[PDB]
Amino acid sequence: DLNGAGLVASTPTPQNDAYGLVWAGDTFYPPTRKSVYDKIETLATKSGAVLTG
Amino acid sequence: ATANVSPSTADNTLALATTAYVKANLADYATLVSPILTGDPRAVTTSVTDNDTSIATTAHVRAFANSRLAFNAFRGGQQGVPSLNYITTVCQFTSSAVRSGWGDNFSSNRWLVGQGGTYYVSVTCRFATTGGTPPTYMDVLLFVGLSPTGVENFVIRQQ
Amino acid sequence: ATANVSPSTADNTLALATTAYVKANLADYATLVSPILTGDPRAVTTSVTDNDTSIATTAHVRAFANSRLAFNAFRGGQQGVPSLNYITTVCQFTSSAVRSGWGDNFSSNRWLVGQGGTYYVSVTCRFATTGGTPPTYMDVLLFVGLSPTGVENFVIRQQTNYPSFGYTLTWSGVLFFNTNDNVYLTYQAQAIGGGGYAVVIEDARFNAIQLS
Amino acid sequence: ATANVSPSTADNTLALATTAYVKANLADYATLVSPILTGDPRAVTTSVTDNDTSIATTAHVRAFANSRLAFNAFRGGQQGVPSLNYITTVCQFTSSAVRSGWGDNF
Amino acid sequence: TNYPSFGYTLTWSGVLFFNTNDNVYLTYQAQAIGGGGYAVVIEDARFNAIQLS
Amino acid sequence: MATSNVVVSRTGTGWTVDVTACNLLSDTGIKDFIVLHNAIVVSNVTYAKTTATT
C-alpha cells in the first residue's frame, strides 16, 4: 500500500462522447462504459423484445 | 590469508576459485559504469512511442524516422465547387495514409491529430473550369482550419 | 588441485566459492563483446548535440528528431514597402522560435546559423496594395541573402495584374549554409499603374529544416 | 561447509575467494536482464543502413537523421525549350548531390 | 502568365511514392501565344527529394 | 506495523542508517529491507544490520 504493487502503463483515455459518426473511424480509443450503456439501452433483444414506436 | 595456486580463468570445475581468478573472469564482463561494448551489442527494440531512458535500437531509430510522416491525403479525379463568392468549402479526399501507433487519423475530409506540436504542412490543388464559356477572371483563397468553416491559417491567394 | 563441493548460486556467506559456482553466477551477466540484452535495459540520455559512439536512448532520439527545425519565424499584419523599382528590402518579422542548444539565433530580420550544413528552407510572403488606385501590374523578386542587400540565392519572382486583392509568393527548397552565417529574406517590388497606393507585406513565414 | 574470512573486494591476490566476495564483486556489474547503465556507456557505431536490434549510438542516429536527404540537384543558367505543342521535355541539370551508401544515383 | 518578358516561376513541394531502381525524371511542357523571334528558356532548376519511409 | 521509506542523502561508505520509521522486524537475522541508491535497486547484502533501528 505504501510503495505499490506495479506500474500501470499509459493507455489512451476513453472518451464519453456519444455514439455516432465519431465512432466510425477511431482505431485508437476505447469507448466509455457510460456511452456503451447509453447506446445499448435503445436496442431490441432477441428473445421477448417489447418493441415500441 | 589462506591461499591456493590460481586456477586457469577457463576452469569450470570444483576446484577452489581464487581471488585473482575471480578478478580475471570479471575483467571480461561489462561494468555498470561506462561499459565499452564491442562486437555486436544488441537489446530489445522498443515501441515507436517510447520516450524514456531505454536504449533505442537501429530498427527503433529507423521506425521513428519513418513515422515522421503524420498523414498523407491524395485526391485524384475531379469535383465541382458547391458555391462561389468566397464561401468557405471543405475539400474532400479520396485516398490517404496515416502513421500507425501515434493516434493520427484521417477520414474522407478531416485529419484528427494524434499529438500536438510543430507540423510541416504541404497543400496543393488545381482549379479549372469545365463546360460553357470560361470566365474572364477567377480569384482563389486557400485555408487550413479547425472547423468546417475554419479560417485559422490562410496560406495563399492567387488570381 | 584442491576441490570442494560447489555451493548454490544463491549462496552469499563465508562458504568457499568454486570455479563452477563462479561460472554459474557469471552466466547471468553480459560480456564486453556482443551482449544480447533482454528485458528493459536503461542508459543515460546524453546531450542532443552529442555526436560520439555513446549509446543513444529513446528520449535522445526523440529530442534529436524534434530539434531538426532550425528556426521558424512568422509575421502577421502589414508592413509598408519603403521603396519600389526593384530595390532590395529586408523582410522583418514579429515572432520567431529557434532550436535550443545548437547556437542558432534569430533577430528581428536575420537568422544566425548555429550549425553549418544543408537546410530545407521555405519562404512565403504576401504582397498587396492598399488605398488609392491599384496598379495595373505588380512584379515581385525574392532572394535569400547573406547580407541585407544580398541576392545570393534567388528563389522566385512572380507577376500579377490585380495587386488590389494581393497575392502570395511561396517557395521551398534545399540551400547550403555555413556556421555563423547571417541569413536574410529579401524582396524587390515594382508596380506600374494606379496612384495613391501603398504596397504592403503580410503573412510572412520563414523556416528552416536541417538536413546535413 | 568449509568457511574462510571474506577477503576485501579490491583484492586481486592468490587468497581463496568466498561467495560473499563473489556477490560483492558481481554487484558492480550489469545483469543481462534489464540493466541500468550509468555514467557514459559506449558501444560500437554500426552501419548507417543497419536495421536490426543492434545498439544505436548517437553518431548512428545523427547519420541516419542527416541521411534523410536522398538527393538534391541544381541547374543554373538557361536551357532552351526544344519544341512547343505540349511536347514533353526532360529538364537537364548541371550539379547534383546524392547520399552515399544506399545505391542512390543522379 | 501574360507577361513572359519577365517570365514566371513554377514551384511545388509534395510527397510521392517510388520503387527501388526506378528512374525519376523532371519533365515540362511549355506554350507560347503571340510575339515573334523569342526563345523560351528554363533556369534556376532545383529538384530534390527527402525520404519519409 | 506501519512503515515509511527513509530517504537520507549521504556520501561515501562506512556509516549507519536510522530506520526507526521503516519499522523493521525485531529479528536481526531477517534482513527485510531493500536499498535504493539514486532511485535504482541495488544489493542489500552490503548493509549489515546490528539493531532493528540502526
User: Measured between CB atoms, does C20 come within 8 Å of chain D?
Assistant: no
3-state helix, strand, coil in chain B (%, to 5): 10, 25, 65
Q: How far is CA C65 from CA A37, C55, C155, C173, in A?
A: 43, 16, 27, 20
What is the chain F residue with the closest CA to D27? Answer: F43
C39 Rama sector, left if φ>0, alpha if ψ -120 to 50, beta otherwise: left
Residues of chain A positioned with their CB less than 8 A from the CB of B114: 28
Q: How far apart are CA B68 and CA B55, in angstroms?
A: 20
> Given an 8 Å threshold on Cβ–Cβ distance, is C43 in contact with B30?
no
Instruction: DSSP for C85-106, please give it.
Output: SS--EEPP-SEEEE-SSS--EE
Sequential DSSP letters for B86-113: S---PPP-SEEEE-SSS--EE-SS-EE-
Mutation choice for E interface testing from D84, D96, D98 by most E CBs within 10 A: D84
Which residues of chain F have a Cβ shorter than 8 Å from any chain D Cβ? Answer: 40, 42-43, 45-46
Q: Please count the residue pairs, one from chain A and one from chain B, whose beta carbons lie less than 8 angstroms apart.
A: 9
C163 close to C129: Cβ distance less than 8 angstroms: yes
Contact: B1, D15; criterion CB under 8 Å: yes
Each as own residue / partner, the long-range contacts of residues C8-14 (CB below 8 Å, 24 or more positions apart, any chain) are C11/D19, C12/D19, C12/D20, C12/D23, C12/F45, C13/D3, C13/D18, C13/D19, C13/D20, C14/D3, C14/D4, C14/D5, C14/D6, C14/D18, C14/D19, C14/D20
Q: Which residue intervals of chain C are DSSP H helices?
A: 19-26, 58-66
Q: Can you tell me the distance from the alpha carbon of E12 to that of C140, in angstroms, rounded to the nearest whole number?
A: 18
Judged by a CB distance cut-off of 8 A, whether residue D93 touches chain E is yes
Q: How many CA atoms are closer than 13 Å to the CA of D32, on its beta-carbon side?
A: 12
Task: Give the cell for residue F7.
Answer: 530517504
Question: How far is residue B125's CA from residue B127's CA, in Å, rounded to a whole number?
Answer: 7
Cell numbers given for E41: 528558356
Resolution of this model in Å is: 2.6
Judge E/F contact: 3 or more CB pairs < 8 A: no
CB contact under 8 A, D23 and F40: no
| DSSP label at residue B153 | E
Q: For residue C77, what is its C-alpha cell?
A: 499584419
Q: Is C101 on the interface with E (CB under 8 A)?
A: no
The residue in chain D having the minimum alpha-carbon distance to the alpha carbon of residue E22 is D104
Give the DSSP per-residue string, C128-149. Answer: EEESSBPPSEEEEEEEEESSTT
Q: How many C-beta atoms lie closer than 10 Å to residue C188's C-beta? A: 19
Spell out which residues of chain B touch residue C5, defining contact as CB-CB under 8 Å.
14
**CA gap B73, B106 in Å, rounded:** 8
Convert F19-39 to b/e letters by CB count within 10 Å (16 or more is b). Answer: beeeebeeeeeeeebeeeeee
DSSP D12: -
The CA distance from B66 to E14, in Å, is 16
Q: In D1-106, which ranges are continuous DSSP H helix?
A: 19-26, 58-66
Query: What's the gap in Å between the CA of C88 and the closest CA on chain B?
Result: 23
**Between chains, do D20 and C13 touch, taking CB under 8 Å as contact?**
yes
Q: Which chains neighbour E (Cβ–Cβ under 8 Å, 3 or more pairs)?
A: B, C, D
Smallest CA-to-CA distance from C42 within E34, D39, A30 is with D39
CA distances (Å), C119 to each of B122, C7, C116, C159, D72, in order?
Answer: 17, 64, 9, 28, 11
Neighbour tally for C209: CB within 10 Å: 20
What are the grid coordinates assigned to A43, written together?
436496442
Q: Long-range contact list for E11-18, CB < 8 A, 24+ apart? A: E11/C155, E11/C156, E11/C170, E11/C171, E11/C172, E11/C173, E12/B124, E13/B122, E13/B124, E13/C122, E13/C172, E13/C173, E14/B122, E14/B124, E15/B69, E15/B72, E15/B122, E15/E52
Cα–Cα distance between E52 and B8 in angstroms, integer? 54
Contact by Cβ (8 Å): C184, C153: no
Residues of chain D with Cβ-Cβ distance to E27 below 8 Å are: 88-91
Beta-carbon contacts of C168 under 8 Å, excluding residues fewer than 6 positions away, are B155, B156, B157, B158, C124, C125, C126, C127, C203
Calculate the alpha carbon distances from D86 to C202, D106, E27, E30, E39 in Å.
37, 26, 11, 6, 16
Q: Do A28 and B107 touch (CB under 8 A)?
A: no
Which residue is associated with the grid cell 544488441? B42
Are D20 and F45 in contact by the 8 Å Cβ rule? The answer is yes
**Residues on chain F touching A3 (C-beta within 8 angstroms):** 5
Is the backbone of residue A12 left (phi > 0), alpha (psi -120 to 50) or beta? beta
The DSSP H or E segment spanning A36 is helix A33-40
Q: How many residues are listed for chain C in this entry?
A: 212
User: In whole angstroms, what separates CA B20 from the centre of its chain?
Assistant: 50
Cβ-contact C137, C119 below 8 angstroms: no
Technique of determination: cryo-EM
CA distance B72 to chain A (A): 16
- Across the D:E interface, residue pairs with CB atoms under 8 Å apart total 71
Alpha-carbon distance of D59 to D43, in angstroms, equals 11
* Interstrand relation of B71-74 and B36-37 (parallel, antiparallel or unpaired): unpaired
Q: Which of B64, B73, B81 is nearest to B139 (CA)?
A: B81
Amino acid at B111: W
The cell 519577365 sits on which residue? E6
Nearest by CB to C159, which of E3, E13, E46?
E3
Q: Which residues contact E32 (CB under 8 A, 6 or more apart)?
A: D84, E4, E38, E40
Task: Please indicate whether chains E and C are in contact, defined as at least 3 beta carbon pairs under 8 Å.
Answer: yes
Nine cell digits for residue C105: 539565433
DSSP H helices, B29-127, are: 58-66
Q: In this structure, are residues C61 and B64 in contact, taking their beta carbons and an 8 Å threshold?
A: yes
Shortest alpha-carbon distance between residue B100 and chain D (Å): 19
State how far the alpha carbon of C85 is from the alpha carbons of B45, C88, C150, in Å: 60, 9, 16
Rounded Cα distance between F9 and C169, Å, is 61
How many residues are present in chain B? 159
- Please report the sign of the dihedral spanned by the C-alpha atoms of residue B6, residue B8, residue B10, residue B12: negative
